[PDB]
């Protein structure tokens, strides 16, 4: 997260950190039930040198605040039993960039570990709405990740504006969120983490960090997978 601030302990208890064997934190995720996380499909694509698609090579840290303190009170470490990438995920365009991660054993909810509510398929996050992004990603493009979880408030961008700022790169599964003046944005290492819409005292997951053109640049807001459209797919594949 560029242009954010340190989160409070326990403030985003649905935020999860996914570490790949021998590499540390790679992507975020969100807790949606005791057994399931939402993340981004593109985090689980192989390269030469590492099979990011292999569920056995990932460790999820729930209840984490500081990457240098992974054995702190309240952290729950879990292996993954499987990764369900969306059937229509396209790794050349990032359309349908969403995956469901099954924990090997359930999380226990606590003051530091709690699920985020899913939006139903009719839920709308209208252009202009202020929502939050969180993660341990880089705090500048080309920089290094944050040890302490970062948060930043950003605004939903109109879909036609989004399409035009990033021409031939935006599909209906995507949403731009940020500021047209840049400054606050997600960045590398925030991928797969949640947008949190705080809106009464209810909080809904709005989307999933996916990609962007650099980070925090003007007229280049971050791009996120929309979540309401996937409610039934989540239900069918996880029961959640």
């Amino acid at each position: 997260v560029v242009g954010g601030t340190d989160a409070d302990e326990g403030e985003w208890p649905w935020q999860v950190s996914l570490h790949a064997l021998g590499q540390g934190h790679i992507c975020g995720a969100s807790l949606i039930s005791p057994n399931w996380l939402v993340s981004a499909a593109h985090c689980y694509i192989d390269d030469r040198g590492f099979r990011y698609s292999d569920p056995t090579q990932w460790t999820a840290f729930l209840g984490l605040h500081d990457q240098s303190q992974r054995s702190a009170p309240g952290v729950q470490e879990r292996r993954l039993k499987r990764i369900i990438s969306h059937p229509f995920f396209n790794d050349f365009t990032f359309d349908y960039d969403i995956a469901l991660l099954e924990l090997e054993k359930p999380a226990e909810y606590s003051s530091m570990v709690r699920p985020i509510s899913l939006p139903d398929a009719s839920h709308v996050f209208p252009a202009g709405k202020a929502i939050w992004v969180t993660g341990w990603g880089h705090t500048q493009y080309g920089g290094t990740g944050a040890l302490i979880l970062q948060k930043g408030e950003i605004r939903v961008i109109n879909q036609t504006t989004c399409e035009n700022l990033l021409p031939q790169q935006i599909t209906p599964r995507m949403m731009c969120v940020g500021f047209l003046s840049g400054g606050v944005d997600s960045c590398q290492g925030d991928s797969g983490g949640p947008l949190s819409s705080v809106e009464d005292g209810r909080i809904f997951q709005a989307g999933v960090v996916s990609w962007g053109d650099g980070c925090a640049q003007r007229n280049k807001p971050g791009v996120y997978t929309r979540l309401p459209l996937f409610r039934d797919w989540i239900k069918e594949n996880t029961g959640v």
């Binding site: 593109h42 694509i45 790794d91 050349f92 365009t93 990032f94 031939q168 790169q169 990609w211």
Partner: peptide, 4 residues
């Protein structure tokens, strides 16, 4: 187009 080349997102990978």
């Amino acid at each position: 187009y080349x997102l990978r």
